[PDB]
Amino acid sequence: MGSSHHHHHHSSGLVPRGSHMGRMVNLEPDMTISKNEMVKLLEATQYRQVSKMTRPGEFTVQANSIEMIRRPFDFPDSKEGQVRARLTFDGDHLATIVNMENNRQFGFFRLDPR
């Protein structure tokens, strides 16, 4: 009984000195971005608001959160599969991104409405 204040803890993996630099890495949170940053990011990540997000590499835009399709299983001779995550923005930083299908692998806290 005890030592469980919150099941989801902020694992500081690439939060300090993540060093993603630019768009040479898959979208994921080591990232600390803002409401507008996402707005440039989809542009910056080659993704644009969508009716309904299901494509490899095309996602849907909302506000404090975007949705982003996760890099599928890809082969050289062959390419297929798709999975999508929901990508949230908390404050001036990226909140999370969650492969919606399993919604547990990453999994972080929701945005507090203002």
> Quick one: CA torsion of 39, 34, 102, 55, rounded to 10 degrees?
10
Instruction: Show the domain range for 45.
Output: 1-114
CA-to-CA distance for 51 and 105, rounded, in angstroms? 26
Tell me how far the alpha carbon of residue 35 is from its chain's centroid. 14
Q: For 17-51, b where at least 16 C-beta lie within 10 A, e where not — what string?
A: eeeeeeeeeebbbbbebeeeebbebbeebebeebe
Q: Length of the chain in residues, anyone?
A: 114
* Helix (H) or strand (E) segment spanning residue 88: strand 83-90
Which residue in 33, 87, 92, 37 sits closest to 59, CA to CA? 87
Q: How many separate domains does the chain show?
A: 1
Question: 10 Å Cβ neighbour count for 53?
Answer: 19
**Closest C-alpha among 9, 46, 13, 12 to residue 27:** 46
